[PDB]
Design a protein around this ligand. Structure first.
Ligand SMILES: CN(C[C@H]1CCOC1)c1ncncc1Cl
Lengths: 156, 39
């Protein structure tokens, strides 16, 4: 099926109509998404089939066809772009300066942008176009707004 | 069955809509992958 690098929608026909459950990044022949989007299920790409290769519920990440390839990191200073792919809407780039998730195991970048649940897996990029992480796992703060982590895997 | 459809290239867009704030939050991550606020 389609193996070209880029951002893709993750769809399902198991519910009413065709519903977008998330988004992912195709890079170096490997499809990258969040675990809560697919629950580790196989994916279809036209006639082809993509099988899970690696995944971790705690990191909330999964790769298909090969190991996790994305290793760019947020520099902790510069603005980034969420390449948001919302359900039924065209892909749009939104620039923001990320905040911080201070955890007991170190700090993580965080983007304060609220999009529908089906936007999960949309990549966050640096000025070079490199994927520094995926959008879709985070928290809801006091006022009801959503703040996602800049979730990045490890490249072996 | 789930399927993928191409949505575009991954490129930085100069003159993109600049929005969102930068909050500093004390958070906790559980074994099920869920983030929570620590107070
Ligand atoms: C609407 N939500 C929150 C979900 C998570 C569980 O309660 C509702 C999002 N989920 C993923 N990506 C972006 C958003 Cl804003």
């Amino acid at each position: 099926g389609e193996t070209t690098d880029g951002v893709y929608r993750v769809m399902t026909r198991r519910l009413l109509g065709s519903t977008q459950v998330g988004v992912g990044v195709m890079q170096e022949g490997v499809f990258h998404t969040m675990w809560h989007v697919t629950k580790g299920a196989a994916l279809r790409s036209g006639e082809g089939r993509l099988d899970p290769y690696w995944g971790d519920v705690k990191q909330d990440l999964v790769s298909y066809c090969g190991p996790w390839k994305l290793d760019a990191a947020w520099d902790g200073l510069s603005e980034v772009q969420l390449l948001a792919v919302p359900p039924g809407e065209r892909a749009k780039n939104i620039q923001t300066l990320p905040g911080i998730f201070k955890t007991k195991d170190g700090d993580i970048g965080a983007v304060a942008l609220d999009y529908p649940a089906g936007t999960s897996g949309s990549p966050i990029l640096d000025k070079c176009g490199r994927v520094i992480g995926l959008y879709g796992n985070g928290v809801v703060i006091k006022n009801g707004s959503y703040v996602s982590a800049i979730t990045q895997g490890k490249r072996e | 069955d789930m399927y993928i459809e191409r949505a575009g290239d991954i490129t930085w867009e100069k003159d993109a809509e600049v929005t969102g704030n930068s909050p500093r939050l004390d958070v906790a991550l559980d074994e099920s992958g869920d983030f929570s606020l620590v107070e």
